[PDB]
Write a protein that binds this ligand. Structure first.
Ligand SMILES: O=c1[nH]c(-c2cccc(Cl)c2)c(-n2nnc3ccccc32)c(=O)n1-c1cncc2ccccc12
Ligand SMILES: O=c1[nH]c(-c2cccc(Cl)c2)c(-n2nnc3ccccc32)c(=O)n1-c1cncc2ccccc12
Ligand SMILES: [Cl-]
Lengths: 305, 301
């Protein structure tokens, strides 16, 4: 029993983190096979960050301008290229600790484990969700760029996030590993801000199932709802639409608890309309929305990697 | 910016996790140099657990009755010894991935990371605290025993917890890596009562400082309190007393923010007495008590 913010074991990713230095800037890179991936703004001075044309800025660099430190060994850079916002440094040595891996782009609401690093060295690991407004509520200090987010499935690490920037309100923006930012954010100095956010409905439902699995049941009720009737209520409370796919993905939790998804939806409807009336669910006084259905299954069923 | 329940990277501990089988029971062990540590109740059946004579039960076991597997590689046990409530299984091979390590016994209120494992393989990693009643609010299923808690103190892995049992409350109890239980719990079936779980006041104050560092300031006020007067309000609300040592440990955060510790006590006093009035602090509608002062400094600077 129990339910915690639970990250994937991070060892497979730790073995891939390196330090990348260009000029007076140091940040983190991800070393997979014979390529090191890092944010392309490693080549930028703070002065460069205004209307930068990265094609100019990168042609003014050579291989010897990049210093890649992998523990006690210096990897020699033998080529470089950029894939949209991600710089790819070709090195002379394939990382012998490369895990089985994929690059995936996740959807708003999906979660991942962040391995926060400084100077190529892992510092901590925590869970994040990609918010509907395409930010993440991370914990990142100066020097954390190039830290990555990932999920694991069996023996395969699926990298889905590379950290690039902090926004004015203290939330974070970054790219997938193929170099495309999540959301309208850009690796240049602009006066932009995160937009209005919403609550990830399918995740709140997953977490209510986690609560039932752990014995917290006070919020259940006798009612059911149709999917459309639920969504008419959800929109009023700034919740994301629940799709039929979300209902399907919640199936395993419904089977394990015996509570139909639309029955859970009626429970959530009543919590939104009445509040929690001083009670708590899994130690929280708010409805938690950064556990996916799979996060609940992997934790409550003891999946290993 | 930002503030998250952050665990230490688990890779150094992953390299020490092994599977330990005795009879039909499989749980986890910790492989350091040529020794594997695991809960001694691995040798018990559920019927043995009703009234176990661990000394007699261990005498009856042989080295070959302990099956140890590191990944898909089998290790041969060449000795077995009581270590309070854990077993030390001597094996043929020193673990080549043994990190620099020490065994530390932690204090109530201190935090640590847990690598939850099943059958010798890792499931996930999370942060938790040793509660004032010497339980931990973990996430553990059947088969998780032998999973360990740890901190990474600079150049060294500090192992502080090995998991042994879930109490009827759904919270968890275990030993340090010397095999001595935290709290009054025992590795046998009892009508074990758990003490009063109280809130870790020094940690709540640390987390309020984290909130100010991150820009949440609405809860500060111009009232004042003495330490004794604050502590009277604290235990009214089932908070632990705040000691002079706690005040000094909050020194670095009070210096960074410019807010005296007793002035933050005045803020916490008002929050306890009036509530939050529908506002949140660091994304929470409740006061968080599982970040130590050290956790906040580590994460915020
Ligand atoms: O580390 C970083 N480096 C840089 C940086 C980029 C280029 C050159 C240089 Cl010299 C630096 C960041 N910038 N700055 N302007 C940007 C504009 C668009 C994109 C990224 C940007 C940045 O946001 N972060 C940070 C990341 N996460 C948390 C942080 C907390 C506190 C301070 C910085 C944090
Ligand atoms: O895995 C475990 N194994 C055993 C066990 C011990 C001896 C023999 C056998 Cl055959 C089994 C546990 N027991 N049982 N009585 C005990 C009495 C004192 C100490 C430990 C005890 C135990 O509590 N746990 C568990 C640990 N954490 C979470 C759990 C969730 C759900 C079920 C079990 C959980
Ligand atoms: Cl809360």
């Amino acid at each position: 029993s129990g339910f915690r913010k639970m990250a994937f074991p991070s060892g497979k990713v730790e073995g891939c983190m390196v330090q990348v230095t260009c000029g007076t800037t140091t940040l983190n890179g991800l070393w997979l096979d014979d390529v090191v991936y890092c944010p392309r703004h490693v080549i930028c001075t703070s002065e460069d960050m205004l209307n930068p044309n990265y094609e100019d800025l990168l042609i003014r660099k050579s291989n010897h301008n990049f210093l890649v430190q992998a523990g006690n060994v210096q990897l020699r850079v033998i080529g470089h290229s950029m894939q949209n916002c991600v710089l790819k440094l070709k090195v002379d040595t394939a990382n012998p600790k490369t895990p089985k891996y994929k690059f995936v782009r996740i959807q708003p609401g999906q979660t991942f484990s962040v391995l926060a690093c400084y100077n190529g060295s892992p510092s901590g690991v925590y869970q994040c969700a990609m918010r509907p407004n395409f930010t993440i509520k991370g914990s990142f200090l100066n020097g954390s760029c190039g830290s990555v987010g990932f999920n694991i499935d069996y023996d395969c690490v699926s990298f889905c996030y590379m950290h690039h920037m902090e926004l004015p309100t203290g939330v974070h923006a970054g790219t997938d590993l193929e170099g495309n930012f999540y959301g309208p954010f850009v690796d240049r100095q602009t006066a932009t801000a995160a937009g209005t956010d919403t609550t990830i409905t399918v995740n709140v439902l997953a977490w209510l199932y986690a609560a039932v699995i752990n014995g917290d049941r006070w919020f259940l009720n006798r009612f059911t709802t149709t999917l459309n009737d639920f969504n008419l209520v959800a929109m009023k409370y700034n919740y994301e639409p629940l799709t039929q796919d979300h209902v399907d993905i919640l199936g395993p939790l419904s089977a394990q608890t015996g509570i139909a998804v639309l029955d859970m939806c009626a429970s959530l409807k009543e919590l939104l309309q009445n509040g929690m009336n001083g009670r708590t669910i899994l130690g929280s006084a708010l409805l938690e929305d950064e556990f996916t259905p799979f996060d609940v299954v992997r934790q409550c069923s003891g999946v290993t990697f």
